Design a protein around this nucleic acid. Sequence first.
RNA 1: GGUGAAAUUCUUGGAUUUAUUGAAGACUAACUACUGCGAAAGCAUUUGCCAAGGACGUUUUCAUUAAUCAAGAACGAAAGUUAGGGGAUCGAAGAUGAUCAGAUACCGUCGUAGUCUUAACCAUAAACUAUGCCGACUAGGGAUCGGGUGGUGUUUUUUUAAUGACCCACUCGGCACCUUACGAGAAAUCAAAGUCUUUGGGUUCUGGGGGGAGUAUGGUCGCAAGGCUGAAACUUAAAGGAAUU
Lengths: 91, 96, 25, 94, 225, 127, 200, 150
Amino acid sequence: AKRTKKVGITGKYGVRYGSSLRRQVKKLEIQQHARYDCSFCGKKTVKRGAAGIWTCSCCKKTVAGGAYTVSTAAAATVRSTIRRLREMVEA
Amino acid sequence: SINQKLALVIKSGKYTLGYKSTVKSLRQGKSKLIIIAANTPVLRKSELEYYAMLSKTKVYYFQGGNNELGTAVGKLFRVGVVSILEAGDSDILTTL
Amino acid sequence: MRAKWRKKRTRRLKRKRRKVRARSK
Amino acid sequence: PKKRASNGRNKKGRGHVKPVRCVNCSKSIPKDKAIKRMAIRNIVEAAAVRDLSEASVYPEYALPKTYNKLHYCVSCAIHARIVRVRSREDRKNR
Amino acid sequence: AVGKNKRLSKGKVVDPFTRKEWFDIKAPSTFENRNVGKTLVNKSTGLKSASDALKGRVVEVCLADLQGSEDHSFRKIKLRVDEVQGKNLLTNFHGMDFTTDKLRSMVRKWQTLIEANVTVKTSDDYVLRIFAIAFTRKQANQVKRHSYAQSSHIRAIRKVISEILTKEVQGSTLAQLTSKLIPEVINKEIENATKDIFPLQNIHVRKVKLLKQPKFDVGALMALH
Amino acid sequence: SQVFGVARIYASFNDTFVHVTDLSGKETIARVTGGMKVKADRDESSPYAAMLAAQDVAAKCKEVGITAVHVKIRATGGTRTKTPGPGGQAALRALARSGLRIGRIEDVTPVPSDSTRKKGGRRGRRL
Amino acid sequence: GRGAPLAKVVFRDPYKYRLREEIFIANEGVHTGQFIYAGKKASLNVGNVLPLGSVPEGTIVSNVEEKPGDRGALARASGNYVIIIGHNPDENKTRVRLPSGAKKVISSDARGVIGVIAGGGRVDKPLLKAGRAFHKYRLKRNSWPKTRGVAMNPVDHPHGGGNHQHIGKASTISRGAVSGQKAGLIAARRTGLLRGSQKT
Amino acid sequence: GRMHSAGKGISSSAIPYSRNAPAWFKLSSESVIEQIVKYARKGLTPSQIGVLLRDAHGVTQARVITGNKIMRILKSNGLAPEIPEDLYYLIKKAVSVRKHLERNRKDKDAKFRLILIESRIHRLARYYRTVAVLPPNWKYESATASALVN
RNA sequence: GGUGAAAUUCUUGGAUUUAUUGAAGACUAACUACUGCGAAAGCAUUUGCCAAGGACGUUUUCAUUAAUCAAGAACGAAAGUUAGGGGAUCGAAGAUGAUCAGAUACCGUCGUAGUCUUAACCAUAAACUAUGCCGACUAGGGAUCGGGUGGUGUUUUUUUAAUGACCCACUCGGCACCUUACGAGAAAUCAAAGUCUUUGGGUUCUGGGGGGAGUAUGGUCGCAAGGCUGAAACUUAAAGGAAUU
């Protein structure tokens, strides 16, 4: 029904805590609360437990990641660089 | 590519999808080729390969996941293991 | 006398008058 | 009014070209806009070849040649007198 | 401008050539006329000695002196010292470069330039990178004055030289490759392997610069000397 | 039959440098340049300072016992001038004509492949 | 008390039939069921405990040990890493890039965990209300809420006193000063806004 | 022309004048229609049926032998596809671009070239709906576009 | 270290440089062209993956599904904004040294934001070919990019079978050039700015003297800087375009 046109998730904070502040909070929480999928099964049901904890209900294989993203961009490039470094080592 | 050959054998030849169908068809040994996704657990691939070796049937892996395989077989749902028992108008047994 | 100087004077005028209006409304 | 058929310098069907830097005044001039003059003068000055030859290892046969490209802005071009304003009748000469 | 210094020093005579000795340079047998020359090094003292500062040393000498022939003028070995043998020092081929002056004469307008590079290890564990030069030719009876390639044949030739240079390097150690690039026998076979795909001319290699080296292996050095 | 050295001429604007060097390159002989021979600060790049500096280098070269050197005249290089200084060939002729044999002339100035950027702004130096 | 999570990994005792409980801070991509490899001969994979003496250049390694037999000294925070920028074969040491941005050499026999610790970018959302800050600081120590020294009584703090709100003396405190007046900036090289580069 | 470009490149075909050609063809009309329906049961689309038949047999255009063009007879024997051959060709191309969009999200050209194919498949669907080929209440769905290719 | 000439500044702790490397960030020089792709902005290392696009050829299919665009949507130089990474050169501000009667500018040295990237905005320019798109016709010549055709054409091996490079002749799509003007234009000039008084192929948008003023106000997008729409009062008889002495 589109109750709130722009505040998005940050409707619980009411009319407080600023505008830009509430906007970064909005972006952080809609990254946080999105439903994710297990890289081992593919079902979009991975949820979040505590900080840095990504726990699913179907695959049942919790994988640690970022506090707000399963694998941040820094994690992705780190994984790629170890991939290539070991590939060079064992080449 | 591979996907068009699977589509062709789906429309022309018979097909079995899922766990129970493929393990049964392996048991009676009516299958010819089996398709297994990469995202599946390793024990899945190991036992499927063991059954295929017992039934001297060939094994082909695909570099993808479950939802990928469901899309590739031309179906709106998802599939993890695909086994064919009769090609018909296709020639996947000849090549690959 | 050059065009961007006309524009800069006009924009300065809009900023001062916008401050005036904000102080009033 | 318009002065040249190729308006700035042969920028036709392209729209944009990567600018370069002049070698005298360091002006950001487009690649095709900056005039390029070959510098094929020898590594030794004018004449005086035998002077080095008498103190040259081996029977000479070196004859090194230096090649360089010079990028000049329009303002430096007129100041260096390499390119000069031409008449309307002359202007259509390449 | 000797009359401009104001603060000569902030904290507040004998020359060092009397402590220098003439050290003759030796070259491997791959070049018949070794005869590189002599250099200068400080006296061998207990604090630093001469072999310590001489162990890492690179000397650039053109091939016209090492090979003798005048046709080897546009090539120069950057010989690197690696041992001292009692007033004579042994050198190994480390740096390869093509004359800077001849680059500017080699590159010409109204044609397309090639560029290829690889990273290939020899048989005796010497990883090397090879860069090759090549320019299009104005063949006989040709009237078009640009000698331009399609640039899709470019993708074929750079693949060809990259594969060929790798294959030629495979199966040869540092002694064998030094005896083949001087005669330029490879450049003859690039034309042989690229004659039917694109005419080409001026096959030359810019640099064969060395990157990594195996263990010292002093006994191999005496083999070359 | 004849010992060999390096000339390593650095000819640029406002100064020209000649550095007698050994084949290794680490040894340094006669580090004089074309700036100490003139007390005007404007004649450094002129041939007058180049010729006088070459004579001083030649005298030092004779003292050590070097009979021949290898020359590589270079400019400032990089993204500043990329052209040899006015006093380059003048210094080269002066030192060669003092009893020193020269051979294998080369240009060793550093040229970039469009690296970094040049000072002056987009409109450049406007005198 | 720790933003980063710890992975409970079990090892097999090679000398006696018992199973031990080791606690390892979780890196990226580590999941339950994954076999972790610890030793000097294991391959280059995320989470391994390979020593710094047998790793190539530029590897991203966390949980770096200062000395052998330390069991955790460097890179123990969420989102931090240590880069390798060279090893010395002889007198084996290793130059490393710690998160602070400084150069240090350590023994090559120091074990480290390959990868970056989980919970990266933890401080990227404000705390908003006082409740989040209170719940975060209640499980670590008792240093919240804090009181400004300028608005303090002169007896309870050197910065306090006076009818106005001003420090009075110089806020910068020399390193040679004794305990009692170390309030404000201690041995500050320079102050003001950090306009420019870090000069690392 | 060049609907979604600014070119004018011409590459077309020119049929011979003789509507009864080529006066050397000997196979009967019953024989040639057998070949087309034999190739039709293989699953080849009429575009591929034409090229194989033209470049292998002594028939270039089946209109001059049969009673109609090769598509028209396909209705008579009931081997036609559920959708026109055109709509299938771009919809399989459209989903290929969409599959590209899902993986990498920085190719602005792929998004722009995506606009071109949308400018096509509604225009062709509108004409097909007008001439009563597709169902009168047929729309194009981005999510269901994958199901269209079967 | 510099400039026409100077100065600030760095130099027994060795400035500048030579010889060996290491670290950091930026760019892809010479080849590089009245030369290529992209709708435009724009795109100038090697290799791999993905998809898309023009041109060529067709005796393959559909069948007029076609041209333009209110409103409405996507991309959009540089500069600017938010949160990070990064932070070597250059460098709005600024600190400075000259010169000038004055210089907070042109000239030299440091130097913040910025110039690089990530995720999100900003929707502007001399964004120009100052020339809207679609379709037909109209004086010629050569060169050049891609493609195709034919000529025991000349080469390129194991002269020869093919390839590849070219030559000759032709053709299509191009960036476009050179000489002329039946034609147009006020001319500068134009093969389109021609087929417009002998006025009509189809279609979208813009202007009615110059200032005021792209301003006031009202709406609307935007965190803001700013963008879109957009006057009136009043004033003047001259502004403006093309060539000439």
